[PDB]
Paper text:
The chromosome region maintenance 1 protein (CRM1) or Exportin-1 (XPO1) binds 8–15 residues-long nuclear export signals (NESs) in hundreds of different protein cargoes. NES sequences are very diverse but each usually has 4–5 hydrophobic residues (often Leu/Val/Ile/Phe/Met; labeled Ф0–5) that bind hydrophobic pockets (labeled P0–P4) in a hydrophobic groove formed by HEAT repeats 11 and 12 of CRM1 (9–16). Here, eight new structures of CRM1 bound to diverse NESs show several different and unexpected NES backbone conformations that share only a common one-turn helix element. All NESs also participate in hydrogen bonding with Lys568 of HsCRM1, and mutagenic/structural analysis identifies Lys568 as a selectivity filter that blocks binding of non-NES peptides.
We tested mutants HsCRM1(K568A) and HsCRM1(K568M) for interactions with three previously identified false positive NESs that match NES consensus but do not bind CRM1: peptides from Hexokinase-2 (Hxk2pep: 18DVPKELMQQIENFEKIFTV36, class 3 match), Deformed Epidermal Autoregulatory Factor 1 homolog (DEAF1pep:452SWLYLEEMVNSLLNTAQQ469; class 1a-R match) and COMM domain-containing protein 1 (COMMD1pep; 173KTLSEVEESISTLISQPN190; class 3 match). (C–D) Structures of Hxk2pep (pink) (C) and DEAF1pep (purple) (D) bound to ScCRM1(K579A). The fourth turn of the Hxk2pep helix packs into hydrophobic space widened by removal and rearrangement of the Lys579 and Glu582 side chains, respectively. Superpositions of Hxk2pep and DEAF1pep onto wild type CRM1 grooves show the fourth turn of the Hxk2pep helix and the N-terminus of the DEAF1pep helix clashing with ScCRM1 Lys579/MmCRM1 Lys568 side chains. The rest of the mutant ScCRM1(K579A) groove is highly similar to the wild type groove. Therefore, the key feature of the wild type groove that prevents Hxk2pep and DEAF1pep binding is Lys568, which is not only a critical hydrogen bond donor for binding NESs, but its long side chain also blocks binding of sequences that do not meet NES structural requirements. Finally, we find that the HsCRM1 Lys568 side chain acts as a filter that physically selects for NESs with helices that transition to strands or end at the narrow part of the CRM1 groove.
Numbering used by the authors:
A (entry chain C): 0 to 376, 414 to 440, 457 to 1053
B (entry chain A): 9 to 216
C (entry chain B): 65 to 68, 78 to 200
D (entry chain D): 5 to 21
């Protein structure tokens, strides 16, 4: 029954409309859902705009009039110029009249703010179409009607605010460059009159709602108007005094003064400098006397969250930081301005104690600006000594967790570290004193807590490298000594676990100290080794992260023979490795072995390095040897989940060590390589035999997932070594041939759901590093993975996402390093290669789309480098316009805006080939064009026809002017892109001006 | 005690997935573009009594926009969503905010950067500053890993109720009823049980 | 001088972290229902044991039912750390409704221990 | 290195003993 309004052969029943609307906004459940679908269909009727003048006159529902204006909005922005000129004047007239009559009825003006704002925006859309060329008296008449009524004057400030927004703040995306400039110049020409009205209202007016609406418009004006309207008038005085006292006007006025602090200003005039000082002086004065004194506890105020306090304190932080970052030098020399300078910063100190993550980051950014300047600028830091001393405490007490998963906490820690490092350089003594004092109150329990000891330990660790080695040594000693005593002072593994971790974090941050005190460094490591036996949650993971963290920095001191030692300490670590790691989880054992590989790589004697490597790998190599013996004996053992897990952990240990050692890992790799690939084959057979006997569901089972883990870690190990190898002859002559024989056929002949995407990733690295040396191997890779992978991913954009990504990474590196492989493809396979590139264009997936566009660009360059030869001539004849049209399609379909830049680059390269005569053969067929026609003429002809059928609502003149500008600008990417954007605007509407494409000229 | 909440942002940013997680606990992997709007009541239990959100989950794709800003009428709070793996979605945040505060001139608004579970983050933390001058709360969130997935509603509840100490509390757990098998449904439940057993559980590699 | 839940009558027999799934038969798809603490609660006035599971942060109930002696924990084809079983009356989301649940844990040890406690509690309720 | 630190840190391993 509600679907009656969707029948236009009959008169629209307004009462039926108001019912559908009410059911949608106030209803619920099914009735709401039904009405919603009816309203959507009504609004999208291309004739629904004709019935808007009826709704706005005879409806009693504001939501219905709002929807009516939305229907008008679509019509004005997309099809205005298609109407008869009588409807344009009519629509204009009854939008103007509707606004006038809403402002005159004080009851409607008060209770229908949403519908009036919607009408003002609708009017603004008309202005963008019709003003000033077809409405030169709009601004003069607006200024006249403002004096006849406070309500109309207030509403005209809303109209001007919205106009300024649409012309200056949101025009870049929504208009052509020519149209944007036209309107910006039009508003600039008549602003002298607009400012006069605005300034008179502010100086004389008393209606607070009128004042606030005028200041909200001023906020938009300040984005673009010249500074003279601000400094050659009394408006700065008004903002910084009068309007800072009223809480109604205070919020907007403060935002206005923040923008004023960003105006383009000549930095050499002394009167202006005084004016900039003065409005800051007035503003701080009004805050101290009308809002709160500089001693006020803003942390407590913000937490109470009364009224708009939180917004005001946010806006004050933005104002103070913006002004001071630009102008604080104006306050630093004159002694009579010193109190103002420091009161402003004391407010920022108080603001910095607020518990609000994002506000703290705003003030922290300013503090960075300040302490960095005091670090380099002569004679400045003594001014801020008391500010800096308070800041040291604020930052130490609000220090956040370093990475030692939250990526918002990692960025903030590094920001805090930066400022605190600067603050330490500025006064090392004050920083040390605060930290020791803070540590004393951890020991007397007055401030003891898990949060407070962690925060202090992070702060202490963050300033590493700022003190002198002698002070650092005294400092580190006191801290560790005090922290160790704090550990005994506590009971319970929970307390002793917190303090233990903090102690190890601090020592891990001062490697300079550890490197100079061997006996200490040694004892530290031994404690970690004993902490690897403590089963308490977190200890073992801590012990291991600290060990490898210390090793990365102090590795040299583990590989040499230290005084009073009979062997390099690495040997002692390796001897007791089974005992040390006996209680660790697999992940933690691998980190340990990785840390040992870091040390071993410091030994540059090949013979001793390989011996250490052999000893480190003794345990996994003996387990390996044992399995390879019995695993081949009874291949069913690999169905034993215990053997599978053991194997996977042995391989993961080799991956860990290979990650640290890279090229030095080759000896160990050769020990397992040939038997590892045999294992890869045996595991493969079982996966295949399991899927044959159980179906595809077998791939989800723990048995098969464990078997595939083996294959994946084997590929990761080979990938890890090859990507770091320095001896590429051995890679090619020893590694590649057994590898390809082991993985390629297995990948090709498995069903889609059993193929490992890691094979593709592994091959990508092989091609990357030695691609130039195995042209036959690359060909073999394409034959085995290309067609069977493409058929997996060319039916939709969702299935096999990992294969999708790795597939185009592989084609990309093959196209870079061994383009000859594609020249060998049969014509039908090269056609699939082209199809696959364009298929990548159409992905929203960024991983795929970007590579697809790069492959296309690189392919064009590869072809071009071939010169005038048959293969290049045939490529252009077969695929030039396919790439041009496919590229144009994603440029204009509105679903691939993330790739605009690279689409534009590809299109500019394609167009420039024809206009530099880099294509030797005609791109047309003998028949369709006269003999001797230039490819330029045919290109513009093809594109003109292509765009005419794809965008039939464009005029032939538009298309012609767009292409003329586009081809003329194919050597200037920024201008090229601007012309494409202009085209993307014009295709959204009817009647685009073809001269807009002459903007660059 | 029900407040209208409008949820806006570019298509594919996770708005519907985010709401679904709060409604049923599930994580939807498929991208089925919202058509116009989808309204769902959402209730939270707090130390100040229960609060109800009438969530208007709108469409981000232009071709499915429906009534567009007509959905914002008389909203009392809002969430703007973008995708930290897609710069374009953050570039469009000022456009969604513009269209929103033109209809809802003074409401609490949360800005959410979704999908921080994805390693290859493209909109870095340092680049997200739009919320400062607009007085929006900001949260990194992931509807997949549940990182900060409750913060947007906790903050909004505290603004709508006017109590900065409002907390989510555990809804009461009534005693569950006693069970009695129906012999006329035994073979019916053992059928659906066999299908459930032989359907693999998703994300078997997740930590839980 | 003058100066200025509903599970308290119960007892926690077992607690474990787990993720709960429900089977959408009409879509042949497991769907998550909540991740949090799964508890076996013994009522002091009836000695009857129930499962009570709440989501993290929001603390909303995602499982609330008796550990009936009739229920039977079954393995899932793709998991060595989960159990599948049918539930004929769960009241986490309003009225009593029947579900085919799946619960997964952090390790195979928690899975077997859960089944151990799950069976101990079944005998408790049989009385 | 200060010799009293050693005495305190050598007991560090036995913190959990
Ligand atoms: N990795 C990840 N994916 C997510 C996350 N949230 C949502 N998604 C995924 O992103 C895709 C889009 O989900 P969706 O909720 O429909 O986004 P939307 O904003 O509602 N789209 P529309 O505005 O067109 O209705 C889905 O595949 C979803 O699984 C997340 O937090 N992390
Ligand atoms: Mg959606």
């Amino acid at each position: 029954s509600m679907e009656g309004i969707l029948d236009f052969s009959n008169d629209l029943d307004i009462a039926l409309l108001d019912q559908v609307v009410s059911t949608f906004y106030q209803g619920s459940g099914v009735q709401q859902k039904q009405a919603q679908e009816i309203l959507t269909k009504f609004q999208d009727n291309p004739d629904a705009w004709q019935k808007a003048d009826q709704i706005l006159q005879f409806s009693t529902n504001p939501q219905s009039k709002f929807i009516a204006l939305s229907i008008l909005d679509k019509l004005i922005t997309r099809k205005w110029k298609l109407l008869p000129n009588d409807h344009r004047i009519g629509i204009r007239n009854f939008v103007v009249g509707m606004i006038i009559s809403m402002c005159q009825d004080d009851e409607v003006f008060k209770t229908q703010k949403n519908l009036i704002n919607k009408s003002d925006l609708t009017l603004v859309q008309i202005l963008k179409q019709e003003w000033p060329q077809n409405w030169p008296e709009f601004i003069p008449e607006l200024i006249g009607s403002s004096s006849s009524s406070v309500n109309v004057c207030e509403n005209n400030m809303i109209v001007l605010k919205l106009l300024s927004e649409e012309v200056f703040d949101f025009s870049a995306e929504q208009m052509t460059q020519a149209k944007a400039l036209h309107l910006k110049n039009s508003m600039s020409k008549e602003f002298e009159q607009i400012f006069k009205l605005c300034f008179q209202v502010l100086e004389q007016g008393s209606s607070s709602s009128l004042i606030v609406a005028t200041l909200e418009s001023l906020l938009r004006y300040l984005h673009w108007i010249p500074y003279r309207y601000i400094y050659e008038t009394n408006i700065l005085e008004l903002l910084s005094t009068k309007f800072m006292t009223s809480p109604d006007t205070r919020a907007i006025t403060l935002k206005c003064l923040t923008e004023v602090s960003n105006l383009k200003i000549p930095q050499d005039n002394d009167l202006i400098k005084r004016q900039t000082v003065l409005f800051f002086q007035n503003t701080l004065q009004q805050i101290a006397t009308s809002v709160m004194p500089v001693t006020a506890d803003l942390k407590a105020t913000y937490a109470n969250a009364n009224g708009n306090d939180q917004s005001f304190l946010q806006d004050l932080a933005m104002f103070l930081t913006t002004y001071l970052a630009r102008n604080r030098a104006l306050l630093e020399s004159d002694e009579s301005l010193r109190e103002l300078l420091l009161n402003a910063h004391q407010y920022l100190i108080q603001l910095s104690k607020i518990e609000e993550r994002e506000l703290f980051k705003t003030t922290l950014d300013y503090w960075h600006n300040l302490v960095a300047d005091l670090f380099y600028e002569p004679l400045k830091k003594h001014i801020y000594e008391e500010i800096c001393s308070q800041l040291r405490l604020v930052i130490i007490e609000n220090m956040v967790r370093p990475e030692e998963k939250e990526s918002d906490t990692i960025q903030l820690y590094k920001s805090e570290r930066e400022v605190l490092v600067y603050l330490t350089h500025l006064n090392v003594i004050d920083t040390e004193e605060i930290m020791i004092s803070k540590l004393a109150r951890q020991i007397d329990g007055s401030e003891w807590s898990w949060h407070n000891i962690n925060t202090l330990s992070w702060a202490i660790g963050s300033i590493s490298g700022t003190m002198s080695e002698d002070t650092e040594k005294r400092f580190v000693v006191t801290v560790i000594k005090d922290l160790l005593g704090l550990c005994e002072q506590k009971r319970g593994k929970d307390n002793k676990a917190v303090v233990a971790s903090d102690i190890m974090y601090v020592v891990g941050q001062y490697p300079r100290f550890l490197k100079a005190h061997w006996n200490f460094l040694r004892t530290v490591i031994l404690a970690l080794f004993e902490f690897m036996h403590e089963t308490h949650e977190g200890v073992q993971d801590m012990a291991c992260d600290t060990f490898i963290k210390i090793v990365q920095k102090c590795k040299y001191h583990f590989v040499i023979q230290q005084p009073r030692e009979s062997e390099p300490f690495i040997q002692t670590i390796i001897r007791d490795i089974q005992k040390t790691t006996a209680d660790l989880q697999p992940q933690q054992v691998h980190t340990f072995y990785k840390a040992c590989g870091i040390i071993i790589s410091e030994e540059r004697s090949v013979a001793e390095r390989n011996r250490l490597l052999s000893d480190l790998m003794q345990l996994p190599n003996m387990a390996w040897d044992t399995i390879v013996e019995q695993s081949t004996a009874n291949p069913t053992l690999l169905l034993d989940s215990e053997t599978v897990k053991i194997i996977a952990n042995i391989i993961k240990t080799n991956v860990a060590v290979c990650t640290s050692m890279g090229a030095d890992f080759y000896p160990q790799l050769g020990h397992i390589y040939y038997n590892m690939l045999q294992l890869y084959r045996a595991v493969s057979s079982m996966i295949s035999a399991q899927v044959a006997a159980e179906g595809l569901i077998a791939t989800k089972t723990p048995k098969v997932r464990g078997l595939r883990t083996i294959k994946k870690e084997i590929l990761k190990l080979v990938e890890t070594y090859i990507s770091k190898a320095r001896n590429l002859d051995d890679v090619v002559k020893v590694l590649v041939e057994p590898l390809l024989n082991a993985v390629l056929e297995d990948y090709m002949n498995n069903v889609p759901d059993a193929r490992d995407a890691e094979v593709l990733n592994c091959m990508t690295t092989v091609v990357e590093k030695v691609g130039h040396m195995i042209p036959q191997g690359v060909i073999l890779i394409l034959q085995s993975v290309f067609e069977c992978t493409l058929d997996m991913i060319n039916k939709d954009f969702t299935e096999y996402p990992e294969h999708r990504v790795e597939f185009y990474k592989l084609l990309k590196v093959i196209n870079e390093k061994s383009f000859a492989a594609f020249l060998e493809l049969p014509p039908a396979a090269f056609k699939l290669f082209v199809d696959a590139i364009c298929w990548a264009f159409k992905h929203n997936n960024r991983d795929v789309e970007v590579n697809g566009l790069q492959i296309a660009l690189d392919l064009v360059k590869n072809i071009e480098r071939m010169g005038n030869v048959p293969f290049a001539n045939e490529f252009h004849k077969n695929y030039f316009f396919i790439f041009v049209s496919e590229t144009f399609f994603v440029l204009t379909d509105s679903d691939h805006k993330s790739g605009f830049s690279k689409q534009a680059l590809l299109l500019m390269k394609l167009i420039s080939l024809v206009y530099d005569n880099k294509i030797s053969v005609p791109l047309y067929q003998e028949a369709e064009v006269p003999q001797g026609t230039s490819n330029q003429v045919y290109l513009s002809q093809y594109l003109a026809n292509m765009l005419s059928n794809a965008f039939p609502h464009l005029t032939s003149e538009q298309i012609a002017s767009f292409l003329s500008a586009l081809t003329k600008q194919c050597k200037d990417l920024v201008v090229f892109k601007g012309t494409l954007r202009d085209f993307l605007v014009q295709i959204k509407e009817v009647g685009g001006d073809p001269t807009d494409y002459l903007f660059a000229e | 005690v029900q407040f209208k909440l409008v949820l806006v942002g570019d298509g594919g940013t996770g708005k519907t997935t985010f709401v679904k997680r709060h409604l049923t606990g599930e994580f939807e992997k498929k991208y089925v573009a919202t058509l116009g709007v989808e309204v769902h009541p959402l209730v939270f239990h707090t130390n100040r009594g229960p609060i109800k959100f009438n969530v208007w989950d709108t469409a981000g794709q232009e071709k499915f926009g429906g009534l567009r800003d007509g959905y914002y009428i008389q909203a009392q709070c809002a969430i703007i969503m973008f995708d930290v793996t897609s710069r374009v979605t953050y570039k469009n945040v000022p456009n969604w905010h513009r269209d929103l505060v033109r209809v809802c001139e003074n409401i609490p608004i949360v800005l959410c950067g979704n999908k921080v579970d994805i390693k290859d983050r493209k909109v870095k933390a340092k680049s997200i500053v739009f919320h400062r001058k607009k007085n929006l709360q900001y949260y990194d969130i992931s509807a997949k890993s549940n990182y900060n997935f409750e913060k947007p509603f906790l903050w909004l509840a505290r603004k709508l109720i006017g109590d900065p100490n409002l907390e989510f509390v555990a809804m009461p757990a009534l005693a569950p009823p006693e069970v009695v098998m129906d012999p006329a449904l035994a073979a019916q439940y053992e059928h659906d049980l066999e299908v459930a057993q032989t359907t693999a559980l998703p994300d078997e590699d997740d930590d839980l | 001088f003058e100066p200025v839940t509903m599970e308290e009558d119960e007892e926690v027999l077992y607690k474990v972290r787990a993720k709960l799934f429900r089977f959408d038969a009409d879509a042949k798809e497991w769907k998550e229902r909540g991740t949090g603490d799964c508890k076996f609660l013994k009522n002091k006035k009836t000695n009857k044991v129930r499962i009570l599971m709440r989501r993290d942060k929001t603390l909303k109930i995602c499982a609330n039912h008796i550990i009936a002696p009739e229920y039977t924990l079954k393995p899932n084809v793709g998991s060595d750390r989960s159990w599948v079983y049918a539930c004929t009356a769960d009241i986490a989301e309003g009225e009593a409704e029947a579900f085919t649940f799946a619960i997964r844990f952090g390790s195979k040890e928690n899975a077997d221990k859960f089944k151990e406690e799950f069976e101990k509690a079944q005998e408790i309720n049989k009385k | 290195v200060p010799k009293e630190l050693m005495q305190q840190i050598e007991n560090f391993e036995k913190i959990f003993t």
